[PDB]
Ligand binder design. Structure first.
Ligand SMILES: [Mn+2]
Ligand SMILES: [Xe]
Length: 128
């Protein structure tokens, strides 16, 4: 995928945001920003330019499911790819997120390999 693609990384914990960001760097993506929750994320997406979103689920202000639903419901971002990266692993949460339009779902903890694999899976289906 285009190495200038702009990513938005969302999680309420810096450690994870940091892992994701560094991982993206390895893959060749430097246009990367961070957000700490749904609200903070929506504001930046409103700033335009974003082409991909990686997000956590449990976060104050607006959690990841809500963010996802909001992004898919907005005519201006509805197809924005959204990859869930969360510790929630119950099948019931995966269903909800998936039904809600998630482009992918990764469970924490995860390896460098797993992430890249999922990202490419999403690129592959969107022809990116
Ligand atoms: Mn969290
Ligand atoms: Xe994330």
């Amino acid at each position: 995928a285009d190495k200038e693609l702009k990513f938005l990384v969302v999680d309420d914990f810096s450690t994870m945001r940091r892992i994701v960001r560094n991982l993206l760097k390895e893959l060749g993506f430097n246009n990367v920003e961070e957000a700490e929750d749904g609200v903070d994320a929506l504001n930046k997406l409103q700033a335009g330019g974003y082409g991909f979103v990686i997000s956590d689920w449990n976060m104050p202000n607006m959690d990841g499911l809500e963010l996802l639903k909001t992004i898919r419901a907005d005519g201006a971002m509805s197809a924005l790819p959204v990859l869930m990266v969360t510790a929630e692993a119950k099948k019931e949460n995966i269903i909800a997120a998936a039904q809600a339009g998630a482009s992918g779902y990764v469970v924490k903890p995860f390896t460098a390999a797993t992430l890249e694999e999922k990202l490419n899976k999403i690129f592959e289906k969107l022809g990116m």
